[PDB]
RNA sequence: UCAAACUCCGUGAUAGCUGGUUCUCCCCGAAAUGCAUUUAGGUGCAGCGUCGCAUGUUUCUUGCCGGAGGUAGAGCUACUGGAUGGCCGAUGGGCCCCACAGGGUUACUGACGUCAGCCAAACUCCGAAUGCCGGUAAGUCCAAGAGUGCGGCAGUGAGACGGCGGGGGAUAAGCUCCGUGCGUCGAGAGGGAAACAGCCCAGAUCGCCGGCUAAGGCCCCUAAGCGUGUGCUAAGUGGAAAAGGAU
RNA sequence: UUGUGCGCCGAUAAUGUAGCGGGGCUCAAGCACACCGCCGAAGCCGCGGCAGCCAACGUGUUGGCUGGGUAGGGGAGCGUCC
RNA sequence: AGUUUAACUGGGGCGGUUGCCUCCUAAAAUGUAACGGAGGCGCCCAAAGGUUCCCUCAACCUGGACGGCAAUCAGGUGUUGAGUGUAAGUGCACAAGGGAGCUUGACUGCGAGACGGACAUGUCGAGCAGGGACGAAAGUCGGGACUAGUGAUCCGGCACCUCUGAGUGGAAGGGGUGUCGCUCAACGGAUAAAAGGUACCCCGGGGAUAACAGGCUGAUCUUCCCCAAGAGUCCAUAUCGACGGGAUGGUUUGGCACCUCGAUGUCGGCUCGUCGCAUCCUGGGGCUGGAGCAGGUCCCAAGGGUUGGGCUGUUCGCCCAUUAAAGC
RNA sequence: GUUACGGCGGUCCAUAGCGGCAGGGAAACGCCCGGUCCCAUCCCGAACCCGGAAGCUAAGCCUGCCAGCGCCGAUGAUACUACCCAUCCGGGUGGAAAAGUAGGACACCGCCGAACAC
């Protein structure tokens, strides 16, 4: 149902789109986690920044 | 010697050495061919040396096809000149050769002499290469 | 010769990941 | 550019009872200079000018 | 010992300026161009330099009319 | 002391030039690009910064729909040019029958066409991704401390290397010149790289004789594994290297 | 005879080993594939103090976000003399 | 006597160039540099402009008097390969190509909204009004198929105006509208007006910038190798091994310009060394087209030694006389 | 409504074209007769224009047939590529050609008019 996010890497060496999209998801620091919907918006952001986030699934 | 009789633009960029062959990846007109494996620019004098190497190793009768022609020049500029001040003049002519591409094709009956000849012509070239039969 | 090569070949280490500055 | 006696020469085109010089640059190795011409002047209307330099 | 080349000509900023979908007022310039790469259709006019422009407001539709890419304008819906 | 002395005065001459410019903390924070230039080491305006007011999310991101492109690539009896090998032989031509006309012959040179395989930054019947322009739907939202307009106050306008794409060069340079919502250094410490501005990780409010992790690494020097399992290596390979040679 | 994974020769400069960072290592302390743990930074967390922007409330309390910084812009202050 | 005498530039100089248009580079929007690659312009135009109407070429096949490869003609195929005033591109057969008749819009007064945009410049512009052209009318015409064909400002000049007229009335003069006068081409144009030397040189600065040296690369140079056409009486490999190819070393002529110009003292000689081996002799050795003496080529090998003299400033070199040998 | 009819148009304009075979002419489309009248040839009533209906569907045109000259054209794979991993090599998530192939296709649609009829 919902996706659970965990930021792993850092935003340094990282481009504008990746940085702005972490901001979009609400992630600023490392080890922050977010409970986000699994809609197309979210899936596209994760496709964008998969190397920065571990993604788990409650559902 | 191999050169064209005239090119429209006699100062060209350097060809690219990126990608694999699209055509000439299949022996066409003979029986025993040469196939490249690397990227390289092959000139006029190399191919002359190679065809002579083959004809002096069969020596009588048996045909040789050259599926390449040096239709792309390169520009040396005269010696001990500081960089700048233009682009040098064409002096030698290359053909680009992408991997998979076929250069030579022989038609001589005995495989012994033929394979040997192609090897002598391989050792006149800058590329790693191998020998091909028309078969699958 | 030697010096430039050893620079350009120390770059292929593991903690550099294939790249270094001024080669 | 300059004022040389260029092939494309001459100017001034004055009006009869119409003082509104209309200008045009033309050649002069051809014959003519006493016919054609027309245009709108001040207070007046579509009437006939000379090429008078 | 000279390179007799070197010259060039400054740009002219050609190409499309109002793509598909957009809202354009009147007299606005859709494309600047040398030849009629794109031709006029409906509610569209041509210039002297083969520029195009709008004659009626609306929105764009780059369609073809017998093999030639056109430009058009369609009626917006009044609010 | 002389390619035009010395002293006082003008005179505190002037220098697009070199140097130097003193106490503290708080907040934000660049640039090394463009056009012009008697100009290229300087400067003016635009660019990027901040302060104040105004306009309130208009900026940015992701998804979906609509639009032009002629790049990579590929293709060519789809045009302009190059070009490999065959078939024919007009047309040419040695030569023969000898009028030379005309009848022809012979590897002859081979159009044009024709079978097959090919190349191209200034060749394209074709044609990707990304990027781009607008619309829409949400997201971020006690914020990005975003955007736009205005006015004050400026600095910069000598950029470097690394990745990707490219020109000049010898497809050499720690070479030079352009691109890039790519990066870092500049202005950025700390850890790793043996030492090492630009590489990888990560962006330092101050303290703690607290804990978990990344890159990297665990025989001793050096804190952590002479760790487990299955195979290869005999060269000190590991811990530089080619064409090529070799039971 | 094909394709592979490690290997051999080719190999070769001048102060001193000197092209593992050293000792040393094949009774791998070397290469590969999987597995287990761990060490490790000024990163994140944990306990505390200060500060700036915003917001909520009450007669200045709390909370979230934030706080590297040169050219430079702005703000708030110590000190000396009369 | 006072002063000028340009800049770019892979140091400067010599050369070349400076503005505008077109194409590629240019990386599928726009834009983008180099002393990068190819060209062109500093015009022409009673029509080569406007409008109404009409038609389609080039090429090939054939026939055909001079006539041939081609001239004008006729008949077919011919979607467009010709031509478009002038370079190239984009377009043009629905023609913007070709042709014929009228003809002056190659006008005046304006201009919504837009592009591009440092700025000044620059580009199109529907639509309104007078007064017209053409056409039966609809409608098109504010130059040319499009983009280049030219130069800001100041100062003067010509025509017209119902603007002003230094007490009044006039006038000069100054204005205004339309217009002219510049290879100011170094083309955003320091003056209307300006070429050179300095080894007599001086000052301020710069490693932003060159020469010696270091450094990077290694075209070039040296050393070495690969393959083997042949030479070698035959015999590819005793010896030389072409045509091509691959690497070293960093000493050579050069490329870049990274530290040093608020000082790194530059050719050779002398004296004094020390190091490498890609070895001149000595020492050990394999093959021979090595009988023997002398050798030729190859491998290992650095301990020691490696002359004195003539010419040249010379390094290098040549010569003389010796040497076990007269090293790089 | 309808037939082998005519005319005006359209398709992001060849799936519609070219060529061959057969076949049709009621009214219409045509070709044809001739230059008296308007009008016209850079010369020509050939064309344009005018006046009529002797003649023929031969041609144009419409209908069916032939997938042959041309065109259209996928799925899947490949090339290339955005992003990420990766000490050179190469690889993973997504996107996705050209060519080739299977095949398609001798067009489709709209309006008015005729003829034909209840």
UniProtKB/TrEMBL annotation, chain C:
Pfam families: HR_L37
Domain of life where this protein originates: Bacteria
Region listing for Disordered, in residue ranges: 1-23
InterPro entries cross-referenced by the UniProt entry: bL37_actino
NCBIfam families linked: ribo_Myco_bL37 (NF047428)
Entry protein name: Uncharacterized protein
Native source species: Mycolicibacterium smegmatis (strain ATCC 700084 / mc(2)155)
Higher taxonomy: Bacteria, Bacillati, Actinomycetota, Actinomycetes, Mycobacteriales
């Amino acid at each position: 149902a919902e996706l659970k996010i965990t930021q792993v890497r850092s935003t340094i060496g990282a481009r504008w789109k990746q940085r702005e999209s972490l901001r979009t998801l609400g992630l600023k620091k490392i080890r922050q986690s977010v409970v986000r919907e699994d809609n197309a918006q979210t899936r596209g952001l994760i496709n964008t920044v998969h190397h920065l986030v571990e993604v788990e699934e409650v559902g | 010697m191999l050169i064209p009789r005239k090119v429209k633009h006699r100062k060209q960029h350097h060809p690219e050495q990126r990608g694999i062959a699209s055509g000439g990846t299949s022996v066409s007109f003979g029986d025993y061919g040469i196939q490249a494996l690397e990227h390289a620019y092959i000139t006029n004098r190399q191919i002359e040396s190679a065809r002579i190497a083959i004809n002096r190793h069969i020596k009588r009768g048996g045909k040789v096809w050259i599926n390449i022609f040096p239709d792309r020049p390169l520009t040396k500029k005269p010696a001990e000149t500081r960089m700048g001040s233009g682009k040098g003049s064409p002096e030698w002519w290359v053909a680009n050769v992408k991997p998979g591409r076929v250069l030579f094709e022989l038609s001589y009956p005995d495989e012994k002499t033929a394979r040997d000849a192609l090897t002598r012509a391989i050792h006149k070239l800058p590329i790693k290469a191998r020998i091909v039969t028309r078969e699958e | 010769a030697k010096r430039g090569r050893k620079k350009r070949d120390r770059k292929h280490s593991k903690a550099n990941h294939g790249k270094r500055p001024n080669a | 550019a300059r004022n040389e006696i260029r092939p494309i020469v001459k100017l001034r085109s004055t009006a009869g009872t119409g003082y509104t010089y209309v200008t045009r640059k033309n050649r002069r190795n051809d014959p003519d200079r006493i016919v054609l011409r027309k245009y709108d002047p001040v207070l007046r209307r579509h009437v006939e000018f000379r090429e008078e330099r | 010992s000279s390179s007799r080349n070197g010259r060039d000509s400054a740009a002219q900023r050609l190409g499309v300026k109002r793509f598909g979908g957009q809202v354009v007022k009147a007299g606005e310039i859709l494309v600047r161009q040398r030849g009629t790469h794109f031709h006029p259709g409906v509610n569209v006019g041509r210039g002297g330099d083969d520029t195009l422009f709008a004659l009626a407001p609306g929105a764009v539709e780059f369609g073809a009319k017998r093999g030639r890419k056109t430009v058009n304008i369609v009626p917006v819906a009044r609010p």
